[PDB]
Design a protein around this ligand. Structure first.
Ligand code: A1BQT
Ligand code: ZN
Length: 139
């Protein structure tokens, strides 16, 4: 679990969005595993606008943060799960690191701000849904 709170927006993994997220929907994209909902309170986070390929992510299944080197956002094949058929997920960044399904939502940050959230993993890989191209989150 986990979310990014920026301005009057909440960014979550689309497959973990709640009834309240869908009732206050701003934007969603199944190919990116992202959903953004509107909030009444002002959010605590800021979004990185950079080309960093290193950062630190929060891993809830270890109660720890780990440093990572990750690929540029790309179109990556993701195996079928209970949430989606087998498909290509876009804007995904992979790194070597630990994850379990419940780690989805953990934030990846660089020195500039939030880069994305944990969205996929397995066998010592972890994948992050990038949010740095979503410029409207800041307006
Ligand atoms: C962090 O996730 C994991 N980590 C380790 C083992 C397995 C997983 N799970 C996944 O990768 N899933 C399940 C949830 C929906 C994901 C998607 N973005 O399509 C795919
Ligand atoms: Zn950065």
């Amino acid at each position: 679990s986990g979310a990014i709170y920026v301005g009057n927006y909440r960014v979550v993994n689309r497959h973990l969005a709640t009834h309240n997220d869908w009732a206050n929907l701003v934007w969603e994209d199944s190919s990116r595993d992202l959903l953004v909902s509107s909030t009444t309170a002002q959010g605590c986070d800021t979004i990185a606008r950079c080309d960093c390929q290193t950062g630190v992510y929060y891993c809830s299944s270890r109660r720890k943060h780990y440093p990572v080197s990750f690929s540029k956002p790309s179109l990556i094949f993701v195996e079928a799960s209970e949430y989606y058929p087998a498909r290509y997920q876009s804007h995904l960044m992979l790194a070597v690191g630990h994850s379990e399904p419940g780690d989805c939502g953990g934030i990846l940050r660089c020195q500039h701000g939030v880069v994305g959230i944990v969205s996929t993993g397995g066998n010592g890989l972890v994948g992050f849904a990038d949010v740095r191209d979503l410029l409207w989150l800041d307006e």
